[PDB]
């Protein structure tokens, strides 16, 4: 990506935060045609800064832009919940070509951390009658919205047959995710147990089920 | 490549 | 007011073709360039290219040469994106966006058009019970296509304690989701529990009694 941005930045309400944007090549030349866009998923992106620092009157005065060397920078003051979004920088690169930075997920920490609740179900009787087996790991009520999920057969890890969702915002503004492990009926009854392991903020919650 | 375009110019020549 | 209004969501098989429209109003269509920008699942914005609405000359970024065509129809102030020989990796939200000047690119954006390319075919779900001082029970809604599925419980009478998780997209192209509800353990045997699953795209509904 011709323009490097941090993958994520976090700040709490009322603070100011800065998102950097560094040119990876000399194709940007003067690097004076830098623009920034706010993007709430599901809606169209919105222009908020152009020519490095110029703010259209239709954007909030809490947004400002600056540059030093080949690093352009977006700063958001008086951080509010509505600022939570993806932010992209953008530069002209000559020959009537434009490029976008990789994007930055801005998280506004308007909420205390929450460890996930985990519920693990074994394959149903019916499913086993159909010669299939699905383990269902349901993950809810965690904040911030990021987990990793690992599965184990007895004590050995398992990545094959694992399908895990992205975290989705719940109505209470905590986050949910689910993970499924597909097995044969034989595998399911082969082992003593299976475990679903949910890691969040460096701590892990593990649930187990067994055919027994 | 002319990367230092005039910001007021319109590319849709 | 400047308005870019794009056509609706598309669902296509690999090798098929698609044509997305971007109708404009509120300015002279031929005075400003129309650019196209893509966002694939889990990725950032990617500049695709543009078309000069005076000369018709199209510019395609590397990565979008070979199968993509920008065009317009001045009789209706509309720009178009056509993709030939669609590939699974073309799955993305496609945006049109105006460039006012080099200083102010992408000042007005369309709302985006989701284009999904999948080799999967319409298929109704297979619903399995997730048997249970509270008790959790649920329904596994397995192997359906396309999105969306809705779930209720006891024909909508049971709304408290209900959590329906967004679906996982399997490597096969089919989706699965789960719905779980938390109920008093003392109610098992007193209260019947049925999840009502509706998959309009396959004209299928399933009511699955969930018991101990
Ligand atoms: N991003």
Distance of CA C158 to the CA centre of its chain: 29
CATH assignment of the domain containing A142: 2.60.40.10
Token representation of residue C39: 């966002």
Residue A69 CB contacts under 8 Å (≥ 6 apart), including other chains? none
A163 touching C (Cβ < 8 Å): yes
Are residues A103 and A115 both part of a single domain?
no
* Bridge partner list, A148: A199
Listed residues A110, A145, A168: the one ending a domain: A110
Exposure string for A68-94, b = 16+ CB within 10 A, e = fewer: eeeebbbebbebeeebbbbbbbbbbbb
Q: Where do we find the tokens 């352009």? A: A72
Q: Is A103 close to ligand 1, i.e. is its CB under 6 Å away?
A: yes
Of A110, A137, A164, the position where a domain reaches its end is A110
Q: Within this chain, do residues A145 and A89 fall inside the same structural domain, yes or no?
A: no
Q: Is the peptide bond before A144 cis (omega within 30 degrees of 0)?
A: yes
A86 lines ligand 1 (CB under 6 A): yes
Question: Cα separation of A173 and A141, whole Å?
Answer: 9
Residues A204 and A175 in one domain: yes
Considering the domain architecture, whether residues A154 and A168 belong to the same structural domain is answered as yes
Question: A58 and A121: one domain?
Answer: no
Domains in chain C, CATH or no CATH each: 2-119 (no CATH), 120-212 (2.60.40.10)
Same domain? For A74 and A85 the reply is yes
Same domain for A170 and A145? yes
Residue for token pair 């105006």? C98
Q: Which conformational region is residue C155 in: left (phi greater than 0), alpha (psi within -120 to 50 degrees), or beta? A: left
Domain co-membership, A36 together with A91: yes
Is residue C51 within 8 Å of residue C71, measured between CB atoms?
A: yes
Same-domain status, A31 and A8: yes
CA distance C204 to A113: 40
Nearest Cα to Cα of residue A15 among A82, A66, A80: A80
Return the residue of B nearest to A98 by Cα. B3
Q: Give the alpha-carbon dihedral of A87, A92, A95, A101, to 10 degrees.
A: -30
Cα(A71) to centroid of ligand 1, in Å?
18
| Cα distance between residue A52 and residue A90, in whole Å | 10
- A101 C-beta closer than 6 A to ligand 1: no
Q: Fill in the DSSP letter of residue A95.
A: T
Residue A195: CB atoms within 10 Å: 21
Q: How far apart are CA A55 and CA A63, in angstroms?
A: 8
Cis peptide bond N-terminal to C151, omega within 30: no
Q: A137 and A41, same structural domain?
A: no
Question: Do A51 and B7 lie within an 8 Å CB cutoff?
Answer: yes
* Chain B contact set for C53 (CB, 8 A): 12
Our measurement of the distance from residue A108's CA atom to the centroid of its chain's CA atoms, rounded to an integer in Å, reads 13
What experiment produced this structure? X-ray
Q: Does B4 touch chain C (CB under 8 A)?
A: no
The CA angle C170-A171-C182, to the nearest 5 degrees, is 75
A197 phi, psi to nearest 5 deg? -115, 120
Q: How far apart are CA C154 and CA A185, in angstroms?
A: 30
Is C149 in contact with C199 (CB distance < 8 Å)?
yes
Residue range(s) defining the domain that contains residue A81: 1-110
Are A206 and A105 found together in one domain? Answer: no
Are both A1 and A101 inside the same structural domain? yes
Q: Which residues are bridge partners to A37 per DSSP?
A: A47, A88
The domain tally of chain A equals: 2
How would you classify the pairing of strands C113-117 and C10-12?
Answer: parallel
**Calpha distance C87→C63 (Å, rounded):** 13
Of A62, A85, A110, the one marking the end of a domain is A110
């Amino acid at each position: 990506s011709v323009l490097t941005q941090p993958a994520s930045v976090s700040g709490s309400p009322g603070q100011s935060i800065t998102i950097s944007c560094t040119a990876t090549s000399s194709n940007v030349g003067s690097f004076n045609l830098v623009s920034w866009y706010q993007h709430h998923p599901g809606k169209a992106p919105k222009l908020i800064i152009h020519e490095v620092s110029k703010r259209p009157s239709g954007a909030s005065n809490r947004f400002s832009g600056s540059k030093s060397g080949n690093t352009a920078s977006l700063t958001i003051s008086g951080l509010q919940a509505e600022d939570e979004a993806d932010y992209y920088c953008c530069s002209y690169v000559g020959s009537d070509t434009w490029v976008f930075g990789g994007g930055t997920k801005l998280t506004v920490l308007g909420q205390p951390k929450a460890a996930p609740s985990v519920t693990l179900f074994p394959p149903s009787s019916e499913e086993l009658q159909a010669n299939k087996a699905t383990l269902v790991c349901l993950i809810s009520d965690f904040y911030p919205g990021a987990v990793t999920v690992a599965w184990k057969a007895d004590s050995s890890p398992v990545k094959a047959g694992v399908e895990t969702t992205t975290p989705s915002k719940q109505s209470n503004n905590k986050y949910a995710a689910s993970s499924y492990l597909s097995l044969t009926p034989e595998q399911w009854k082969s082992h003593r147990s299976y475990s679903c392991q949910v890691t969040h903020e460096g701590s892990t919650v593990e649930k187990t089920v067994a055919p027994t | 490549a002319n990367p230092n375009a005039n910001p007021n110019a319109n590319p849709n020549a | 007011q400047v308005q870019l209004v794009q056509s609706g969501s598309e669902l296509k098989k690999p090798g098929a073709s698609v044509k997305v429209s971007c109708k404009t109003s509120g300015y002279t269509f031929t005075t400003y360039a129309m650019n196209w920008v893509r966002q694939a699942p889990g990725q950032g914005l990617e500049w695709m290219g543009w078309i000069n609405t005076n000369t018709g000359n199209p510019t395609y970024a590397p990565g979008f040469t070979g199968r993509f065509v920008f065009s317009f129809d001045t009789s209706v102030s509309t720009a178009y994106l056509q993709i030939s020989s669609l590939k699974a990796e073309d799955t993305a939200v496609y945006y049109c966006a105006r460039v006012y000047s080099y200083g102010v690119p992408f000042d007005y954006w369309g709302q985006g058009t989701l284009v999904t390319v999948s080799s999967a075919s319409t298929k109704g779900p297979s619903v399995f019970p997730l048997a249970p001082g509270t008790a959790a029970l649920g329904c596994l809604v397995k192997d359906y296509f396309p999105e969306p599925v809705t779930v209720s419980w006891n024909s909508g009478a049971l709304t408290s304690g209900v959590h329906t998780f967004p679906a996982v997209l399997q490597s096969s192209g089919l989706y699965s989701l789960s719905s779980v509800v938390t109920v008093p353990s003392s109610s098992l045997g007193t209260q019947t529990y049925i999840c009502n699953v509706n998959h309009k795209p396959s004209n299928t509904k399933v009511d699955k009694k969930v018991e101990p």
